[PDB]
Amino acid sequence: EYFKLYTDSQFLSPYAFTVFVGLHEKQIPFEIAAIDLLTAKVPVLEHNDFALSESSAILEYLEELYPDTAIYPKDIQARARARQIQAWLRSDLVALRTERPTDVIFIQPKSTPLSEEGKKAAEKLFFVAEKLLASDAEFLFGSWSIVDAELALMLQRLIQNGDAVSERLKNYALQQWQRPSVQKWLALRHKAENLYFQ
Amino acid sequence: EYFKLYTDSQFLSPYAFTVFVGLHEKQIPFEIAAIDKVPVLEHNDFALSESSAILEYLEELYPDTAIYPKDIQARARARQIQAWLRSDLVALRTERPTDVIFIQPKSTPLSEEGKKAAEKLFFVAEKLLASDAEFLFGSWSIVDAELALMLQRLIQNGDAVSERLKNYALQQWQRPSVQKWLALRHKAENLYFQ
């Protein structure tokens, strides 16, 4: 009955993005607020008297609260695979996340070329996404899941910065970006920055 | 019916460790192979990686032997602490790799940010272990073993750790599932390497 989402004030967080998308897809009404820089970091979800951080935890909690609007695949093995890709995006690809922060998607590209480890994460990303998206799939697991939004953002770190990305993966990412829930994030960023900063 | 777990050759992986602990607690028989990222769980025709995903998969297959708290909010906090230990504490996981627990302690002091990580960990652990608690969320859960291991990176390397936390880590480390893993490492020596 009461849901509030806390994001970073500049809306650069990929995990806040991910929870916002999850809430909108599940059509859960909620309020948003911003913080400047047992919870460590944004995003934090408050639900009545209960406050919760870490995006994967928050999502899992939302699925349990509302099981009939799943944002993970329904087959048990596809769901496991979805959790795997999600965990992998969160914790691996360290060089990529470091060298292409979300600043490159929302503000301006970085001049610096990918380091050797940077190039290696990008290729590993391309390998995995092209494997999971073979046969010209529109989504990773048949129909849309929150992991489509997470993968697209990851790819966008490269695309929006100018780095080399296959035509097939740009098409996937661009289409994912035009998802309405995502589009609602992108608009919110600009509107909120005009209000929050007096 | 058929499960196979793949760990790193030298049994240093905290994520393989966590999976190994979870299977044993749930009493799921499985075979173990070492490779020279892990862990990978193979279940019949299905291969799966990333430890959090593997545990959620095992919970969905065997809901009766649960290793997450029953209460939904407690379970969410469990998933939170588990996610945080996976991704945060970065200075600590680099400066105190699991080598210091299973093989040899390190002499290198502990970087500035290394100290900060250790401090966040203490703070979080002291909060969750309110009063006299044996386990984080009342009954044992997988997050106990995960938090015990993280603490062990400090205890086993000598580094200063509140006595309240040692008795927690010590008690968790004496669990048979954790003990089987300690015994695995040695016995894979005379086997695997010929």
Short mmCIF file of N, CA and C in Angstrom, two decimals, chain A residues 38-41 47 50-54 56-57 60-61 64-65 76-77 79-81 83-84 87-88 90-92 124, chain B residues 37 46-50 52-53 56-57 60-61 72-73 75-77 79-81 83-84 86-88 123-124 127-128:
data_model
loop_
_atom_site.label_atom_id
_atom_site.label_comp_id
_atom_site.label_asym_id
_atom_site.label_seq_id
_atom_site.Cartn_x
_atom_site.Cartn_y
_atom_site.Cartn_z
N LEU A 38 20.08 -2.18 6.69
CA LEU A 38 21.53 -2.16 6.85
C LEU A 38 22.15 -1.75 5.52
N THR A 39 21.39 -0.91 4.83
CA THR A 39 21.69 -0.48 3.48
C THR A 39 22.99 0.29 3.30
N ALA A 40 23.79 -0.16 2.34
CA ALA A 40 24.97 0.57 1.91
C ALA A 40 24.62 1.67 0.88
N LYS A 41 23.95 1.28 -0.21
CA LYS A 41 23.82 2.15 -1.39
C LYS A 41 22.41 2.18 -1.99
N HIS A 47 8.80 -0.27 1.75
CA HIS A 47 7.46 -0.80 1.63
C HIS A 47 6.89 -0.80 3.03
N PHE A 50 9.13 -1.45 6.13
CA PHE A 50 10.23 -2.32 5.74
C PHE A 50 11.04 -1.65 4.65
N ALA A 51 12.34 -1.53 4.88
CA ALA A 51 13.24 -0.91 3.93
C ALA A 51 14.27 -1.95 3.46
N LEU A 52 14.56 -1.95 2.16
CA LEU A 52 15.32 -3.03 1.55
C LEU A 52 16.26 -2.51 0.44
N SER A 53 17.51 -2.97 0.41
CA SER A 53 18.43 -2.56 -0.63
C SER A 53 18.91 -3.76 -1.46
N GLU A 54 19.84 -3.51 -2.39
CA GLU A 54 20.33 -4.47 -3.42
C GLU A 54 19.25 -4.83 -4.45
N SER A 56 18.78 -7.02 -6.95
CA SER A 56 18.32 -8.40 -7.14
C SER A 56 17.44 -8.85 -5.99
N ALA A 57 17.81 -8.45 -4.78
CA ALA A 57 17.02 -8.74 -3.59
C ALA A 57 15.67 -8.06 -3.71
N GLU A 60 13.42 -9.78 -6.38
CA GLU A 60 12.97 -11.06 -5.86
C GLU A 60 11.81 -10.86 -4.87
N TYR A 61 11.94 -9.82 -4.06
CA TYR A 61 10.94 -9.48 -3.06
C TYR A 61 9.63 -9.03 -3.71
N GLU A 64 7.82 -12.15 -5.18
CA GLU A 64 7.16 -12.89 -4.12
C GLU A 64 5.87 -12.21 -3.66
N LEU A 65 5.90 -10.88 -3.58
CA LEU A 65 4.73 -10.09 -3.18
C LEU A 65 3.64 -10.11 -4.24
N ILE A 76 11.15 -22.94 -15.09
CA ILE A 76 12.11 -22.94 -13.99
C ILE A 76 13.57 -22.84 -14.46
N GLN A 77 13.88 -23.43 -15.61
CA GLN A 77 15.27 -23.38 -16.07
C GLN A 77 15.62 -22.05 -16.74
N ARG A 79 14.19 -19.23 -15.89
CA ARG A 79 14.30 -18.33 -14.73
C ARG A 79 15.67 -18.40 -14.05
N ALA A 80 16.18 -19.61 -13.91
CA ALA A 80 17.51 -19.81 -13.35
C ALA A 80 18.54 -19.16 -14.27
N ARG A 81 18.41 -19.41 -15.57
CA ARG A 81 19.31 -18.79 -16.55
C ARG A 81 19.20 -17.25 -16.45
N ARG A 83 18.35 -15.46 -13.77
CA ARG A 83 19.07 -15.07 -12.55
C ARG A 83 20.57 -15.15 -12.74
N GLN A 84 21.02 -16.09 -13.55
CA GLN A 84 22.45 -16.23 -13.80
C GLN A 84 23.04 -15.05 -14.59
N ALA A 87 23.10 -12.05 -12.39
CA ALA A 87 24.15 -12.05 -11.38
C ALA A 87 25.47 -11.68 -12.04
N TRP A 88 25.64 -12.22 -13.24
CA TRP A 88 26.84 -12.04 -14.02
C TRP A 88 27.04 -10.59 -14.45
N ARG A 90 25.82 -8.05 -12.89
CA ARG A 90 26.06 -7.28 -11.66
C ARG A 90 27.50 -7.34 -11.19
N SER A 91 28.12 -8.51 -11.28
CA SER A 91 29.39 -8.77 -10.62
C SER A 91 30.61 -8.99 -11.52
N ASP A 92 30.39 -9.51 -12.72
CA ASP A 92 31.48 -9.64 -13.68
C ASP A 92 31.54 -8.38 -14.54
N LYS A 124 33.40 -10.69 -24.10
CA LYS A 124 32.71 -11.69 -23.32
C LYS A 124 31.22 -11.39 -23.27
N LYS B 37 33.21 -18.94 -15.27
CA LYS B 37 33.75 -19.08 -13.91
C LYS B 37 32.99 -20.12 -13.07
N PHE B 46 20.79 -29.78 -17.63
CA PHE B 46 20.88 -28.34 -17.43
C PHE B 46 22.18 -27.95 -16.73
N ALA B 47 22.97 -27.07 -17.34
CA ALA B 47 24.14 -26.51 -16.66
C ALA B 47 23.89 -25.08 -16.21
N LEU B 48 24.23 -24.77 -14.96
CA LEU B 48 23.94 -23.46 -14.37
C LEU B 48 25.12 -22.88 -13.58
N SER B 49 25.41 -21.59 -13.77
CA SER B 49 26.46 -20.92 -13.00
C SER B 49 25.94 -19.73 -12.18
N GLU B 50 26.87 -19.09 -11.44
CA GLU B 50 26.58 -18.03 -10.46
C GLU B 50 25.87 -18.58 -9.21
N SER B 52 24.38 -17.44 -6.32
CA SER B 52 23.03 -17.00 -5.94
C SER B 52 21.96 -17.64 -6.83
N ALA B 53 22.21 -17.71 -8.13
CA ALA B 53 21.25 -18.31 -9.05
C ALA B 53 21.10 -19.80 -8.78
N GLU B 56 18.94 -20.33 -5.52
CA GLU B 56 17.53 -20.09 -5.81
C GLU B 56 16.92 -21.25 -6.60
N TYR B 57 17.69 -21.77 -7.55
CA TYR B 57 17.29 -22.93 -8.34
C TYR B 57 17.06 -24.15 -7.44
N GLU B 60 13.90 -23.81 -5.38
CA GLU B 60 12.69 -24.06 -6.16
C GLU B 60 12.47 -25.55 -6.45
N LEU B 61 13.54 -26.33 -6.40
CA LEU B 61 13.45 -27.76 -6.64
C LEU B 61 13.11 -28.48 -5.34
N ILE B 72 8.95 -13.60 4.74
CA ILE B 72 9.29 -12.95 3.47
C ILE B 72 10.24 -11.74 3.60
N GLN B 73 10.08 -10.96 4.66
CA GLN B 73 10.92 -9.79 4.86
C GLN B 73 12.31 -10.22 5.32
N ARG B 75 13.66 -13.12 4.62
CA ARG B 75 14.25 -13.70 3.42
C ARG B 75 14.82 -12.62 2.50
N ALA B 76 14.11 -11.50 2.37
CA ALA B 76 14.58 -10.39 1.54
C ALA B 76 15.86 -9.78 2.10
N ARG B 77 15.91 -9.61 3.42
CA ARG B 77 17.12 -9.13 4.06
C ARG B 77 18.24 -10.16 3.87
N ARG B 79 18.60 -12.19 1.23
CA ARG B 79 19.06 -11.98 -0.14
C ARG B 79 19.86 -10.70 -0.27
N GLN B 80 19.48 -9.67 0.46
CA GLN B 80 20.24 -8.42 0.50
C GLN B 80 21.68 -8.61 1.00
N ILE B 81 21.82 -9.23 2.18
CA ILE B 81 23.13 -9.36 2.79
C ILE B 81 24.00 -10.21 1.89
N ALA B 83 23.78 -10.40 -1.35
CA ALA B 83 24.13 -9.68 -2.58
C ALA B 83 25.23 -8.69 -2.29
N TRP B 84 25.12 -8.07 -1.13
CA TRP B 84 26.09 -7.11 -0.65
C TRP B 84 27.46 -7.76 -0.43
N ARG B 86 28.52 -10.30 -1.92
CA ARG B 86 29.04 -10.69 -3.23
C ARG B 86 29.77 -9.54 -3.94
N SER B 87 29.22 -8.32 -3.82
CA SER B 87 29.65 -7.19 -4.64
C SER B 87 30.41 -6.09 -3.91
N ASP B 88 30.07 -5.83 -2.66
CA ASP B 88 30.75 -4.78 -1.92
C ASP B 88 32.02 -5.35 -1.29
N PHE B 123 30.21 -3.59 11.45
CA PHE B 123 29.01 -2.83 11.78
C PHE B 123 27.75 -3.59 11.39
N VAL B 124 27.71 -4.06 10.14
CA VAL B 124 26.59 -4.84 9.64
C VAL B 124 26.40 -6.14 10.43
N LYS B 127 24.98 -5.51 14.04
CA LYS B 127 23.56 -5.17 13.96
C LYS B 127 22.66 -6.39 13.81
N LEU B 128 22.96 -7.22 12.82
CA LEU B 128 22.16 -8.40 12.51
C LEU B 128 22.22 -9.44 13.62
#
